[PDB]
Design a protein around this ligand. Structure first.
Ligand SMILES: [Zn+2]
Ligand SMILES: [Zn+2]
Ligand SMILES: [Zn+2]
Ligand SMILES: [Zn+2]
Ligand SMILES: [Zn+2]
Ligand SMILES: [Zn+2]
Ligand SMILES: [Zn+2]
Ligand SMILES: [Zn+2]
Ligand SMILES: [Zn+2]
Ligand SMILES: [Zn+2]
Ligand SMILES: [Zn+2]
Ligand SMILES: [Zn+2]
Length: 251
């Protein structure tokens, strides 16, 4: 599609992250209101998730069981909420400096861009032993995504680039995006196409796996977009941060 639609959220203050579950429910970190909201497919009325004590949340992810993971940026922590629960859990990450993005793989491992420590960390489900991924030369990373094979994709915000690291490899590569300006969000779909919010250029770009040729998605009117998600139908959801709204484009 080349016709975007604005999702019927309301009252957002510079939304920062977005995720979409297998039922098409859309989850958004409403950064400036210290809360996370969600909208079921077809619904015209959001609900607020029962997280507590959030300071300007920044990334969100949802797993196949509907558990919602949120980077509680201002409290240097990552929290999660199981489907139907009213009681969040704080994951046992330590030493985080204003975490930004979060991703969760098919094994339930949770990956966090530890923005202010220039690194990416992960915790296997149920573990309290965090691991620092062997990326090198990052500068305040901002988004993270993980594909079906466990390959990790990171927006290396301060270096205007996107890097990738296969599970068990110690050697990252740089994806051949071009002309990015402080990219923020990243998502990877089931085809391995990588989507990036090119924050400083007010646009969203994508790169098919193994291609050297990015394309610009036909969104309109974006103002410093911040997060991107892609559902199983290939619909692309973007937090249009500077316009206080979430937009989507069908495949
Ligand atoms: Zn902002
Ligand atoms: Zn802000
Ligand atoms: Zn902020
Ligand atoms: Zn901040
Ligand atoms: Zn910050
Ligand atoms: Zn920062
Ligand atoms: Zn920063
Ligand atoms: Zn920055
Ligand atoms: Zn920046
Ligand atoms: Zn910026
Ligand atoms: Zn900005
Ligand atoms: Zn901003």
């Amino acid at each position: 599609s080349n016709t975007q639609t604005v999702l019927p959220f309301t009252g957002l203050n510079t939304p920062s992250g977005v995720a979409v579950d297998s039922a098409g429910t859309v989850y958004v970190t409403d950064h400036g209101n210290n809360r996370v909201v969600k909208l079921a497919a077809g619904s015209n009325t959001q609900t607020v998730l029962p997280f507590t004590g959030l300071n300007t949340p920044s990334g969100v992810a949802v797993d196949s069981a509907g558990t919602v993971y949120v980077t509680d940026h201002g409290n240097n922590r990552v929290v999660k909420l199981a489907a139907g629960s009213n009681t969040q859990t704080v994951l046992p990450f330590t030493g985080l400096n204003t975490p930004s993005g979060v991703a969760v793989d098919s094994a339930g491992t949770v990956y966090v861009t530890d923005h202010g420590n220039n690194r990416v960390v992960k915790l296997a489900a149920g573990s309290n032993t965090q691991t620092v991924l062997p990326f090198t030369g990052l500068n305040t990373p901002s988004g993270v995504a993980v594909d079906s094979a466990g390959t990790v994709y990171v927006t290396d915000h301060g270096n205007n680039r996107v890097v990738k690291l296969a599970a068990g490899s110690n050697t990252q590569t740089v994806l051949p995006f071009t002309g990015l300006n402080t990219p923020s969000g990243v998502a990877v779909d089931s085809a391995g196409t990588v989507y990036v919010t090119d924050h400083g250029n007010n646009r969203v770009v994508k790169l098919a796996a193994g291609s050297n040729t990015q394309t610009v998605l036909p969104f309109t009117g974006l103002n410093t977009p911040s997060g991107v998600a892609v559902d199983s139908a290939g619909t692309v959801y973007v937090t249009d941060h500077g316009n206080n709204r979430v937009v989507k484009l069908a495949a």
